[PDB]
Design a protein around this ligand. Structure first.
Ligand SMILES: CC(=O)N[C@@H]1[C@@H](O)[C@H](O[C@@H]2O[C@H](CO)[C@@H](O[C@@H]3O[C@H](CO)[C@@H](O[C@@H]4O[C@H](CO)[C@@H](O)[C@H](O)[C@H]4NC(C)=O)[C@H](O)[C@H]3NC(C)=O)[C@H](O)[C@H]2NC(C)=O)[C@@H](CO)O[C@H]1O
Length: 159
């Protein structure tokens, strides 16, 4: 059971999605820390909503979409379509992230950590949130410490 929509999710809704993601990526060998650092980013990017378009601008494929706000959205949507997966879909988005780890896409090593190091890391969810921000997300504004607070909130509050 997950929320998928073009709307900002409440804390309770985010928690449902966030536990789903933790379960899913644990089976694909990520640490709880690495997953929570990424969750702290996804909260700021999309309120952890796989259905969410940047500015709630539905159908604008030039801008951000989905859990991590793939920009331009077409980078991701093209991949889903080309792969025969529905793009507006929790699992399709997690499959993209796994595909990126596997093919060393998206990640730029700015912090002397590779993506494959990242998903096996037991550094703090705060430290990982900051590394994921700098290496994977890379938004115009870089000092977004909120993302680390959030990573710690999910690590505490999920199972
Ligand atoms: C206002 C705001 O911040 N909007 C947010 C989005 O910016 C953000 O999405 C992320 O945006 C950045 C910057 O536009 C983007 O980072 C760029 O990624 C490309 C890789 O595709 C890099 O370009 C390549 O560089 C290498 C080496 O120089 C070349 O070999 C290659 O040819 C280049 N490819 C092309 C086609 O350009 C850029 O160097 C790099 N720029 C920066 C500043 O790092 C991220 O990939 C975007 N993130 C995601 C997840 O897609 C989004 C997420 O925070 O949120 C919006 O709010």
């Amino acid at each position: 059971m997950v929320y998928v929509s073009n709307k900002y999710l409440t804390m309770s809704e985010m928690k449902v999605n966030a536990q789903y993601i933790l379960n899913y990526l644990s089976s694909n060998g990520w640490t709880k820390q690495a997953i929570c650092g990424m969750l702290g980013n996804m909260q700021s990017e999309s309120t952890i909503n796989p259905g969410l378009w940047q500015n709630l601008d539905e159908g604008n494929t030039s801008l951000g979409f989905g859990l991590v706000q793939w920009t331009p959205a077409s980078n991701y949507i093209n991949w889903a379509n080309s792969q025969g997966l529905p793009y507006k879909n929790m699992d399709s988005e997690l499959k993209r992230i796994i595909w990126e780890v596997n093919n060393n896409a998206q990640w730029i090593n700015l912090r002397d950590m590779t993506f494959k190091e990242y998903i096996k890391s037991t550094k703090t969810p705060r430290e990982l949130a900051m590394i994921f921000l700098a290496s994977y997300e890379r938004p115009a504004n870089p000092n977004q410490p909120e993302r680390g607070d959030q990573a710690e909130y999910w690590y505490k509050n999920l199972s």
